[PDB]
Amino acid sequence: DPTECDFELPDLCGWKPDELHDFDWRRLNKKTPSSFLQTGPSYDHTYGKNGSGYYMYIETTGRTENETARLLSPVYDAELAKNGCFIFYYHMYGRGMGGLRVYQKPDRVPMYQLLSSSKRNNYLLFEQWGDQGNEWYSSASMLTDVDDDFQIVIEGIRGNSFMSDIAIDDVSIQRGENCTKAMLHHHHH
Ligand SMILES: *[C@@H]1O[C@H](CO)[C@@H](O)[C@H](O)[C@H]1NC(C)=O
Ligand SMILES: *[C@@H]1O[C@H](CO)[C@@H](O)[C@H](O)[C@H]1NC(C)=O
Ligand SMILES: [Ca+2]
């Protein structure tokens, strides 16, 4: 089972969309169709500028504000019981940008409770809102021991206009030292 994905292949290292959401994340190469209007990446993080590498993104043209898209990792087996990390890169460029949330879902926990307002703070690894500029940022999140198998859930929320494309790339789970390193140089909480 792969613990990292650069999204270069169409099978996405076993990541799959949520069976009940508003729309799918898309895999794409370079520029988003709405790019000319100051939104979305111009290239992925793996191969960078001039590069032709692939990222995942929400197409926000023709969707409604606060509609959500979810991308789910394969199911992992207590690889969090170490010093577990989730590390990923994201691109949030666009006026009227929506939001990006990253949850850790224990397998037993149904997606309904996971997302509910009542209980989602216990599971949020990452939450960001608004325009962040034309640039790839990164995040590293400590992962809690839930004594269960689990999934990583990346949820994009469309903003108030079609200029709210969000992209992810280069996702990763790591353990131990690699975590303390990551925390030394990745933005974290
Ligand atoms: C959309 O969600 C954000 C935060 O959850 C909230 O501030 C905003 O008012 C919501 N707008 C609508 C129209 O649902
Ligand atoms: C940290 O990363 C290196 C290179 O990928 C690898 O050799 C090492 O096994 C990793 N450490 C742990 C504790 O997984
Ligand atoms: Ca990539």
Author numbering: 137 to 325
Provide the publication's sentences verbatim.
In 2018, researchers in China found that the scavenger receptor-C (SR-C) of S. frugiperda (Sf-SR-C) is the cell receptor for Vip3Aa. They showed that Sf-SR-C could mediate the toxicity of Vip3Aa through promoting the internalization of Vip3Aa into S. frugiperda cells (Sf9), and that the complement control protein (CCP) domain and MAM domain of Sf-SR-C (Sf-CCP and Sf-MAM) were directly involved in the interaction with Vip3Aa.
Using X-ray crystallography, we determined the structure of the Sf-MAM domain at a resolution of 2.25 Å. The space group of the structure was P3221. Only one molecule was present in one asymmetric unit. Two disulfide bonds were formed by Cys141-Cys149 and Cys221-Cys315 near both termini of the protein. A calcium atom was present near the N-terminal of the structure. Structure docking analysis of the Sf-MAM and Vip3Aa C-terminal domain (CTD) excluded the possibility of the two proteins binding. As some pathogens can invade host cells by binding to scavenger receptors, our structure of the Sf-SR-C MAM domain may provide some insights into insect–pathogen interactions.
